[PDB]
Design an enzyme around this catalytic site. Sequence first.
Site, PDB file in Angstrom:
ATOM      1  N   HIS A  30      18.057   4.037 -32.615  1.00  0.00           N
ATOM      2  CA  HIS A  30      16.671   4.098 -32.056  1.00  0.00           C
ATOM      3  C   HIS A  30      15.584   3.970 -33.131  1.00  0.00           C
ATOM      4  CE1 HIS A  30      16.557   8.640 -32.785  1.00  0.00           C
ATOM      5  NE2 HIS A  30      15.291   8.328 -33.120  1.00  0.00           N
ATOM      6  N   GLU A  54      24.304   5.567 -30.989  1.00  0.00           N
ATOM      7  CA  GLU A  54      23.193   5.901 -31.911  1.00  0.00           C
ATOM      8  C   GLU A  54      23.557   5.564 -33.360  1.00  0.00           C
ATOM      9  OE1 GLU A  54      19.480   8.110 -31.309  1.00  0.00           O
ATOM     10  OE2 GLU A  54      20.012   5.990 -31.430  1.00  0.00           O
ATOM     11  N   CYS A 139      15.184  10.946 -38.663  1.00  0.00           N
ATOM     12  CA  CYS A 139      16.321  10.225 -38.040  1.00  0.00           C
ATOM     13  C   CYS A 139      16.787   9.056 -38.921  1.00  0.00           C
ATOM     14  CB  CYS A 139      16.021   9.773 -36.627  1.00  0.00           C
ATOM     15  SG  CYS A 139      15.935  11.160 -35.452  1.00  0.00           S
TER      16      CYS A 139
HETATM   17  O1  LIG Z   1      21.853   5.294 -26.869  1.00  0.00           O
HETATM   18  C1  LIG Z   1      20.640   5.358 -26.994  1.00  0.00           C
HETATM   19  O2  LIG Z   1      19.870   4.303 -26.836  1.00  0.00           O
HETATM   20  C2  LIG Z   1      19.923   6.620 -27.349  1.00  0.00           C
HETATM   21  C3  LIG Z   1      20.439   7.889 -27.297  1.00  0.00           C
HETATM   22  S1  LIG Z   1      19.210   9.031 -27.613  1.00  0.00           S
HETATM   23  C4  LIG Z   1      18.114   7.739 -28.000  1.00  0.00           C
HETATM   24  C5  LIG Z   1      16.732   7.996 -28.446  1.00  0.00           C
HETATM   25  C6  LIG Z   1      16.378   9.212 -29.038  1.00  0.00           C
HETATM   26  C7  LIG Z   1      15.073   9.443 -29.451  1.00  0.00           C
HETATM   27  C8  LIG Z   1      14.106   8.464 -29.275  1.00  0.00           C
HETATM   28  C9  LIG Z   1      12.698   8.703 -29.725  1.00  0.00           C
HETATM   29  F1  LIG Z   1      11.861   7.729 -29.371  1.00  0.00           F
HETATM   30  F2  LIG Z   1      12.164   9.817 -29.232  1.00  0.00           F
HETATM   31  F3  LIG Z   1      12.594   8.807 -31.048  1.00  0.00           F
HETATM   32  C10 LIG Z   1      14.449   7.254 -28.689  1.00  0.00           C
HETATM   33  C11 LIG Z   1      15.747   7.025 -28.273  1.00  0.00           C
HETATM   34  N1  LIG Z   1      18.627   6.544 -27.822  1.00  0.00           N
END
Ligand SMILES: O=C(O)c1csc(-c2ccc(C(F)(F)F)cc2)n1
Length: 172
Positions: A30, A54, A139
């Site tokens: 992400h 992820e 992250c």
């Molecule tokens: O498999 C996926 O696509 C997945 C799992 S959690 C995630 C995710 C977590 C945080 C954010 C944020 F925008 F808040 F940073 C955006 C996506 N993506």
Amino acid sequence: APPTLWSRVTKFGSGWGFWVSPTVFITTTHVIPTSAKEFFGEPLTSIAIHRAGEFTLFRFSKKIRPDLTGMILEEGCPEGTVCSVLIKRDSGELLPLAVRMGAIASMRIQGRLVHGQSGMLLTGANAKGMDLGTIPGDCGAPYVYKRANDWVVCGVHAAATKSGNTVVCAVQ
Ligand SMILES: O=C(O)c1csc(-c2ccc(C(F)(F)F)cc2)n1
């Protein structure tokens, strides 16, 4: 943590990534800029992308970081291993947060569904806030530990609970 490990931590998208070798870069899916067609001067054409939830791994067709040696990447670590998360913060401050690692877990965090290796921070009673715990900008930061005489990387920072105590490492 050794200077070579900090040298590999690269600002990337909305977070970080990590050079495992001169041609291999890992990060948290992400944080990847969604419109991007070019990485470190190379087109997608020249890059092998391996994506599992992820966890994302880029393999380049030329040496982007010839200053580095290749190190060991493993799929998580044994339950009870203490890792450091290699977090860079505002101003050349280096924050290697200590985590005790647990089981592979599926979780819901701020509404989204998250899968990887769970851990508990060893920084304080709870890790709410930027002083003792993680923030969304962390992250992609790597999870590393020393085993006998060398260092292992075993995943990338994907998520943390509201209390902050629990973190998730996305794994190969
Ligand atoms: O498999 C996926 O696509 C997945 C799992 S959690 C995630 C995710 C977590 C945080 C954010 C944020 F925008 F808040 F940073 C955006 C996506 N993506």
